[PDB]
Amino acid sequence: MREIVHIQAGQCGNQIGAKFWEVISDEHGIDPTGSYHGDSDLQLERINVYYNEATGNKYVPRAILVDLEPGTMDSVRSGPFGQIFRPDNFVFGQSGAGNNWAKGHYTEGAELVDSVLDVVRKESESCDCLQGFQLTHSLGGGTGSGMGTLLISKIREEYPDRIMNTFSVMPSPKVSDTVVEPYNATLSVHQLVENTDETYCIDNEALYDICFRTLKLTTPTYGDLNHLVSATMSGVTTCLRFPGQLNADLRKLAVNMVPFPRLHFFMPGFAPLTSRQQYRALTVPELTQQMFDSKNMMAACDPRHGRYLTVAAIFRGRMSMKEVDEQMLNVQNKNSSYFVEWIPNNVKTAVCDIPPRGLKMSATFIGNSTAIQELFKRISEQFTAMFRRKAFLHWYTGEGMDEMEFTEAESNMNDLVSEYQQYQD
Amino acid sequence: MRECISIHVGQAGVQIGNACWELYCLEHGIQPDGQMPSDKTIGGGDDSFNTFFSETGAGKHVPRAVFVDLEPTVIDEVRTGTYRQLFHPEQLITGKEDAANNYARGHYTIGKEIIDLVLDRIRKLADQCTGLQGFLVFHSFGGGTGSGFTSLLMERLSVDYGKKSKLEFSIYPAPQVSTAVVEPYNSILTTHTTLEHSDCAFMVDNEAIYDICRRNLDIERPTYTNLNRLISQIVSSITASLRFDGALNVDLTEFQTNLVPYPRIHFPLATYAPVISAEKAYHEQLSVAEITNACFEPANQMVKCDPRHGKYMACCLLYRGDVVPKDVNAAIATIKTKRSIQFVDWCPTGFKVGINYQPPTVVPGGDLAKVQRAVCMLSNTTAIAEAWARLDHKFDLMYAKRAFVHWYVGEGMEEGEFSEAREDMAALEKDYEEVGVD
Amino acid sequence: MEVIELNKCTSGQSFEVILKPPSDPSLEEIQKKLEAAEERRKYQEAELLKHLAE
Amino acid sequence: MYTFVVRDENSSVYAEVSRLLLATGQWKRLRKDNPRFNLMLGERNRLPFGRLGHEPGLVQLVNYYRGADKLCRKASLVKLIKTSPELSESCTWFPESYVIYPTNLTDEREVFLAAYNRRREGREGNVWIAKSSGILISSEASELLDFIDEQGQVHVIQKYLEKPLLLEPGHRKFDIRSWVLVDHLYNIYLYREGVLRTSSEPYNSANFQDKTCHLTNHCIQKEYSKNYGRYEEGNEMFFEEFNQYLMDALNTTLENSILLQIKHIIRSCLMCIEPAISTKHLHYQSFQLFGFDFMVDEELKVWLIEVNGAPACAQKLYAELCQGIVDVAISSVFPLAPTSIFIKLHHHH
């Protein structure tokens, strides 16, 4: 019984989190009311990892919904699987955060954080043996970014020896809501550098390009983007939600993916990504090639611009595990220039027999690459183009922040970039 | 009669232990419920099999075994498995969260809080023994529990049972069946702290077992069940002398006397033949000469290495099945005139031979075919030092960058323990080179 | 090629063939190591809490 | 795409093999410490054979046979010939040799003297040569033994061929170099092209002090000889000229008079150590290029001088031999997407 507590905060965090619970509920056979209706015992083997079991054989997600405005969580409560969440687990204010990191982290968010921790403590007290937490949020807004990182800081103070992982959506000028997103993202990234064990970097720029170029979606929407995130979150959590020769908790996976404490920002990837030729069988070679292809990556960073410290590949569906090893060993032994040679056997493969809904087989890619530095450089440069003119700072100084805190977050992220660069050479 | 207590640590130790005791029962005619019809002494006896099995008043034969794991999922298999009735709950110890492949977590953080409970359970088994010989310890090198807790346990066992021998069955890490990159760290940390507490250690390289399963059993992708059944056959061949009437390796002390002239160099190479696929139409039965000759082919060694380029310090041949001394000696003469068998000048050039007439037992539905005769050679070669050099080199690559070191320091281990353990391994490699130099 | 120490029983036999002649820490100390590592964990955790308190 | 590493920057032979591999567009060179290689062009000394064949899914091959140094060491070769029944102490194609350790350190001092005194008493030629892995030629055992004690490494004293075959005109000594390639299947291939390293000075039996007419080394002739390059360019006569000479002068051929013995010697040496170094059932594979050095006496009997484990090649023959290495040694294990230049010396494995 290795329970995980899920937290979703802000608009982005709650909309991606909702779809995540929609997808995995379908895979485990949980209907919108929490009743089980599957046909395989593998569905219930590890169900308690993400679901609590209530009276009447009902399964309730171990999820806490957080926001500083009601709108998004009203939509969740009225959505497809809205009724499956615990009513007491909705914690929300009315003020909003105005896409303002300071409001989420220091003012509005500070008034609500204690009530969120009460629910978190309630979910944790009922865990036989809590592994750790996972947070879904964006870094470009105010609630998920500002209050999300505030929540991480107070969760680490109370549960210092528990794993803290996040799925973090990084802002991009191509899919943007406001101009202050580089400010909010730079402030958050430093919080994550310190207080998370694993952070999956989901770049809205990559999500957009995949929809526009690969999926041939003329005008991508946030929904189209969240389909990619749902599928990716299901792939990264597959091994914990189903049984197999892989007996790994969050800490074991962290111990084998993070060689240096601050370098824990991952590039996720998924395959296939097919446009509506959608019935064609996808061979193992094709799954492997695409899974390592940059165009299937979701961090908007070119893996050929850096080096892989560690890689984890998860294959789902009925397939030849012999042919899997052959193709995996093929990709490594054919591009060993992009793998650091001072971490032997740093490419690990994991298989799962249950494929996602509507797919014969799939593959999820989790890379700890120094190329991720290009993402932090992009944000850093957008931050500095504005901060050198102190543009839009009054939104933040009005909440009590000083310019010094920005200068320190600027330097903290340039230090992070410099740290990736040394290991890339 | 003198008792032997088996200790199974971590997933590797526990799953291999489960396969061995399954095989032990099949070899001694013990049913899953513990009954043993051929045992005419109900509720006691000092027979050979009694070294591994105690007896209750009701006639149950209970393994002299403790299983220890920091998470319960693997040991829960034993609790609800075919042989659940063999053991009682006091023999199965499980924590709630494992060492996360972190030596420091198993040895220090978690080991400190569970060591005393594990010793208490072992003491209860020891109190049933009239003349305990010592312990057989099964564990992996790579796991956080198999590496970290085992080394702590071995340190304490040397305190609480100073005059008892301790043998090891250790699983050497192979990337083909591992998802962990830190196992070189764990292997070298546990070897350093266990070296002076172990009288004789049989390393099994998962790489070797993996390739034997694919090559000889025609398994395209062997599983832990395939690997463990083959390993339990090798283990059974090694411990048979303790469980059956005989005169060779009759007690644990004799393993050191016959295989380990130098204490630190206590890692004998195991070679086993024949391994024949059960799915075969029907295999030609190999002769004594052929299976004996097979003991000098690298393809059936428990650790891939080249004994042609080392020196031998000791050599035992353990035969099971239809084998007579006449044919063993005739085969040995043929192999000397053909093979490259160089003993060290301060050791006699000879072989100790043991023959058990009962052929190998095969688990029904298993992968191994019933053979009329089989042999396991235990030779203390300097060539096994190739295995340490491989492991130490991977250690050096990661430690030069301090990759993953913070995970260990975070659990209270000092960084100096890495270099302390590495320097000890360097001295071990130098000891091998001093013994096998021309 | 000499054979020595031939022993025979109903379940097997054993012998030796010669082809050619030749030419710890106390319980107290283990507790200190364990407690020392525990103290280092405590110190490191206290520094984290101090950091979070600031 | 195959991958190889280069761990010997001084090998002219495998510097060309590496140049050819890359030219095929189907081989990629990795950093010398990258373990994910198919082929290793290893270092000469302390090559880590123990780390080969442990990479999942990679068939690995190395250009050196582990244990072949027994054949390619001065003292090692002598011990092997005397102790191996296949070669026996009565081996007819190897000069009487002895392993002598300097007194400042088994040893064959007395055995050598016993044979030495026998020749001195029998009026027979008693000229011996001392060398190690720095050569002295003398007819007095006192000088030979004293010269070795002044050194601090093992030496070998073997009988000096006092009746060498002398080329005309010039009246000059020579030796024959043969390149042999043993592949992973332990096939023994003899390169069809050999080279005679000739001395450009007249052979003088009444003066072993001047070692320029006695040592046919390409470096000694080009440094201490005053007729270097007179009769043949670079004191290198090739088989076509030598075969034409043997016909004109001795009314015989190179195949009949010499090559039959050379092929016999090669097979005998390599078959002897095959059980010790074969990689047939090993987790990795080996091949290796050897340089056999022979001497011919005036009776047209061939004598084995030494075996070189890391030989160089005659400038004119680098392209053909190196290509031949890629064909039978490398591509035979890693095929790509004639009239062979080698002579296969058949044998029983």
Ligand SMILES: Nc1nc2c(ncn2[C@@H]2O[C@H](COP(=O)(O)OP(=O)(O)OP(=O)(O)O)[C@@H](O)[C@H]2O)c(=O)[nH]1
């Ligand atoms: N031969 C064999 N090897 C195993 C088996 N189980 C695990 N291993 C190997 O053991 C190493 C991993 O260590 P484990 O024993 O699984 O870990 P542990 O001892 O339980 O310690 P934790 O980290 O707390 O889980 C890897 O090299 C595996 O390949 C098994 O059943 N048979």
Ligand SMILES: Nc1ncnc2c1ncn2[C@@H]1O[C@H](COP(=O)(O)OP(=O)(O)CP(=O)(O)O)[C@@H](O)[C@H]1O
């Ligand atoms: N027993 C012997 N009788 C006559 N000449 C001999 C001899 N031993 C050596 N030589 C001469 O010495 C020369 C080289 O000797 P040797 O081969 O032992 O040194 P070396 O190994 O440094 C040269 P290489 O390795 O390139 O063949 C040969 O060309 C040969 O002419």
Ligand SMILES: Nc1nc2c(ncn2[C@@H]2O[C@H](COP(=O)(O)OP(=O)(O)O)[C@@H](O)[C@H]2O)c(=O)[nH]1
């Ligand atoms: N991928 C994705 N990104 C989103 C979604 N909603 C908002 N974003 C991004 O999140 C950032 C805005 O933060 P938001 O979550 O709306 O602010 P918050 O409610 O205060 O946490 C911008 O970078 C948006 O592009 C969504 O549904 N999917």
Ligand SMILES: COc1cccc(C(=O)Nc2ccccc2F)c1
């Ligand atoms: C001169 O060009 C500039 C200057 C300053 C900032 C940016 C920029 O890219 N802004 C941005 C990036 C991600 C999300 C929202 C954003 F507003 C561009």
Ligand SMILES: COc1cccc(C(=O)Nc2ccccc2F)c1
């Ligand atoms: C919130 O973050 C999470 C949640 C659940 C699982 C993981 C994870 O890292 N899983 C994993 C990594 C490598 C290989 C196989 C795996 F299953 C991360």
Ligand SMILES: [Ca+2]
């Ligand atoms: Ca307020």
Ligand SMILES: [Ca+2]
């Ligand atoms: Ca009895």
Ligand SMILES: [Ca+2]
């Ligand atoms: Ca002891």
Ligand SMILES: [Mg+2]
């Ligand atoms: Mg918004």
Ligand SMILES: [Mg+2]
């Ligand atoms: Mg475990």
Ligand SMILES: [Mg+2]
């Ligand atoms: Mg030489």
